[PDB]
Fold this protein.
Amino acid sequence: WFASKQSLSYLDGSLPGDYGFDPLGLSDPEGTGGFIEPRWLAYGEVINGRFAMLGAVGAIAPEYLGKVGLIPQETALAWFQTGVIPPAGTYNYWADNYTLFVLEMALMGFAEHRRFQDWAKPGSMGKQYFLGLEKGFGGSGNPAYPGGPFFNPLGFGKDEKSLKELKLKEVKNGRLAMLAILGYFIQGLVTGVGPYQNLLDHVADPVNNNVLTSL
Amino acid sequence: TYQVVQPINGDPFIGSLETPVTSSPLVAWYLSNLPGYRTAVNPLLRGIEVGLAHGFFLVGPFVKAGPLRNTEIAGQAGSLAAAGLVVILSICLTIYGISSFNEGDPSTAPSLTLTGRKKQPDQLQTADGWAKFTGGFFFGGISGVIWAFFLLYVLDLPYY
Amino acid sequence: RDLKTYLSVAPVASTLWFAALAGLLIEINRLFPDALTFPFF
Amino acid sequence: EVKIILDRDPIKTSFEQWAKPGHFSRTIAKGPDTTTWIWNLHADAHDFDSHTSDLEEISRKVFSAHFGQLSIIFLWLSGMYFHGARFSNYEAWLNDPTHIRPSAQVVWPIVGQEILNGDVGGGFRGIQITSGFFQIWRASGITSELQLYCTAIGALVFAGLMLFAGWFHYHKAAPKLAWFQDVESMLNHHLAGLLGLGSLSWAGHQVHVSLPINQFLNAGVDPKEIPLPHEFILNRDLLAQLYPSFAEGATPFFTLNWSKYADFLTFRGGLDPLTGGLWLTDIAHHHLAIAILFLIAGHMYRTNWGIGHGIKDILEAHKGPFTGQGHKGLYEILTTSWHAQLSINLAMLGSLTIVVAQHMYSMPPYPYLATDYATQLSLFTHHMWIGGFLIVGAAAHAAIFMVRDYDPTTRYNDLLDRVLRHRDAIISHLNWVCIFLGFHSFGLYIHNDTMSALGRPQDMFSDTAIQLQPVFAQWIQNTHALAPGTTAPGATASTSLTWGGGDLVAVGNKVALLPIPLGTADFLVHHIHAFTIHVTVLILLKGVLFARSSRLIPDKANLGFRFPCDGPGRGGTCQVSAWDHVFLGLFWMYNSISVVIFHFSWKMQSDVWGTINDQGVVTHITTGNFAQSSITINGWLRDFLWAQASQVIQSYGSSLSAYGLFFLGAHFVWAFSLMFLFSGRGYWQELIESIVWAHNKLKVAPATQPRALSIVQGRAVGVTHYLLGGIATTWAFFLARIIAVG
Amino acid sequence: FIGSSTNVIMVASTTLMLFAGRFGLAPSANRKTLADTLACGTVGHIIGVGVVLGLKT
Ligand code: CLA
Ligand code: CLA
């Protein structure tokens, strides 16, 4: 009763953004164990999507702004160029590049680890160990949406069953960011230059631009 | 549904099997006409043929590969060796017979035909017949060697 | 783990024993090489 | 049906079972009463189908076991790369490969061993290696010890991942029986995924790292000066100055119109006159065809989209008048029996290792491999043994299948049938061929020995007397000579230099390769090969075909696969079992392979390897005496064994004295095997009775009652030491000879 | 190499055209066919390349 592509039995449509598409049958629940369980993937697409959703913006925002914004030496190099050492060679920073990563892994280590606990236990995280926010923790029944408040300060459709009509929105945008970023990986890889900068050439003239053209 | 390979004479609990090399009409015809299988013929008669063929044939290898020729004028004398081997062999046959079959005894071949036609008593395979067969084998063996040798004297053949 | 201790003391006890012996013998030699006799009396 | 990923949740993980020896078997988990218990524990350790009867459990055991195997191979590779980084003269060898001896193992100065650290060149003291790793590393464009060190870590990391996977797929997520059985799937992946992408992947490193760096090394530039591999990827300019086709991107590939890529890929063929190895430009191109071929091949079998092949369909449709409904039911057998699969795989993997050896000597792939005779003799001989052993193992598991998994009532085959229904016809004929081959190969030698000893050289089988010219192999040899330009216009030079005719390649003062002559001497040895191989086949095939039943033993299948006999009755029935046929076949494989590697060693030194100066004058190592003295058994005893064994028996005080020690050491364990092979446990057990008496006398008799080895074990022990002794002798003999002389 | 491109396109078309005359998902695959296009596409590419290289000589 809904638009759908490809064939599988368990894609009920009970999951947001379900177009019933799993040609590889990754979500088939016959044999489950490990990371092949279906629910995990449901959680993963969303996490990967949220992160991707966010990253795509990072990839181009600095690019775009130095272009029509106030950014100097810190002028966005290609998104790829700051972090990976060989092309841009990076940029100095208040802190050493390797060290930041340690700190960076350190900070993430706390947030990410806890999130997992939410998945291994409902309210475990939100329970015990002192400090405020623990109450903040344990929120929700579902790990995917901790139902922050905290994570959601503003009900924002949380109450309305319309929250569904958000979930999908969140989900569809997520696939979109995902797709996008993968593009960069290639664009930047063959194109060099910046994804946004890359965009202009197609823009300055299009016949001249594109992959066939690119070659 | 058609298999070519079948049990022997239709009996799957007996040794052999039927294959194109065993029961072909060509193989059957050829083997039934060798001197050995002419059950109804004189054993002595059957032998001579075997001797002649075998004798004649033996001269070749002895002469060509012999120590005496190999560029050594001895030549066709080898054939003489062959004449010596048919003597050794004759001896063996005479021995095989003497030991095998006894004078009084009767044939030991098989009387039933393949088709069950009990109608057939057969062969040499008796002290009397075998002696005849070997005796004829010899005569034929010597004569076989001689005629090949005889050809050797006349010459003309490409190998020697 | 009691049990782990139990894996040990099997024929791994032989190798731990002989490896210790080999080491001791090797060091002795490194310390006193080429000895054909006991010369301390 | 639809193919998918199927697993089960945790199935236990504890040291509890480590503390309990022989837990896997219900008979042996009770502990020892006699010393036989101990041997049985190690002999049934890997017999998984003997542990349980569930096919799912057995399949899960062998799957993690493979992870365990890979973990070791990765750990093993980690060490070779590490030793090439800390304890080697690779950087020294990289400048002067033609004079400096490759070495990658330093010995501690204890007890006097430091003598084994000989003059290997490059201002370095150590043991000369014949593994061939230096020529692999130079071929991969590996310059520094840093890169070997990074690979060492990479391999070690992989070793951890492999080991972790095994635990994960036995203790955490265990694949289901339906998953293992998806053979149409697995073949598709191993064809396309493992082999196709694998070959494709290496074709890439070659045309970006190997080919660029190797050209620098050949130009003569100092290795330390050569830009790192990643300077070729980033700045295409460097990889444009050499191999200018890189000027364009995916074109012409994307626009087809192949190719201006003939620049770094070609069908040149032959051998590089400067490196002595196969053209890297050809090898990279070679892997390009292999990739695509296997990628194409990886789409034959039908899975979850109706397009492809059902293997079960293919088999059933292959039936003739001669064979019945044969091939029908083979799919169910090969998807239900592990031993059946292992037998085929051993037979084929073993056969592959043998063609590898013959292909790597005649078509030297790595740079500076051909003129390093020490390595080439080792590589050829090594693969001959590895292949040789694996083939014997095929017979063992073919036999095990017949005893354990063969069931006409459940999984009939018709092809396997009929064969059993005339097994006497096959064995009796194979019997005859062997006797014919024995006389017509070996008997010719004995003829030659007797004629020579009687002073009749003209009455021998030789090139100077009664010739047995192997014309069929000669005609072929000539055909491959006239192959380039005529038959294969794209090929510039010949396939191998053994087919060259009038072409020679030298590196340093040593001969890399040249046209290998074939005469009466080569005729005799090949029939000896044809002879020894058949007899090995006879012993093993007899064991498999008569594994279940026999006119002597109607119910041999009930006695099992590995049993000593069925008593002294019926005249005696020792070694009727299929196991004992594998045991007997082992000696004959040894016999066959030994005369093969002797055929190699003598032929190469005599007719191929040697010194060449700049006048064209070639001086071979043994000076071309193969033709006139290998045609006699006394010749093999004298001009081959007696003459060439002088290096290993004159190696004391030298750097090669360890070979002198292993030479005698291996003679020892070989003769030692004969105690077990010529005697029976009846004597030994009675002898142990008198010795047990003495211990009881002094109150020092053990509870674990000492017993003599089982009848089968006595054979297992005997053939094991016979093999170890015999093979290790030739090892010490070969390496000492070829390192000193070469 | 426009002629070359046309040749490749012709091969691909002939292969996809077989989405009737030839093999695809065929009698009863549980799919809504993508598989057929690819193979037909790939087969077409292979045929085109083979013909083209021959054209090159
Ligand atoms: C793919 C390779 C492969 C695999 C997986 C197997 C697997 C198996 N084999 Mg087969 N086999 C193989 C190849 C293989 N084999 C080859 C190449 C041969 C020819 C020799 C054989 C001949 C063979 C026989 C005759 C038998 C088996 C049996 C078995 C089964 C149990 C064996 C066991 O418990 O291990 C136990 C392992 C040991 C006891 C280790 C013994 C050490 C060896 C003998 C000497 C090693 C010395 C070393 C190389 C160098 C010396 C170092 C030293 C100084 C320390 C098991 C299914 C047995 C069976 O009954 O099948 C169900 C059986 O009787 N195999
Ligand atoms: C050097 C010792 C030796 C010799 C000569 C043989 C010989 C033979 N073996 Mg044995 N084998 C041996 C050691 C030996 N083996 C050992 C140590 C083992 C333990 C593993 C085995 C295990 C073994 C098995 C399991 C089998 C054999 C088989 C065979 C026969 C193979 C067929 C053949 O060649 O016919 C030709 C005969 C020869 C080449 C012998 C030499 C003949 C001379 C040179 C010519 C005759 C001399 C003269 C004219 C005679 C007249 C003299 C007069 C005064 C009496 C052959 C008789 C196979 C078999 O039975 O054959 C089908 C068989 O299956 N062997």
Observations:
- The pocket of chlorophyll A (ligand 1) is lined by residues D 42-47, 342, 346, 389-390, 392-393, 396, 400, 561-562, 579, 582, 586, 720, 724 (CB under 6 Å).
- Chain A is about 45% helix and 0% strand.
- Chains A and B do not touch (no CB pair under 8 Å).
- The two ends of chain A are 44 Å apart (CA to CA).
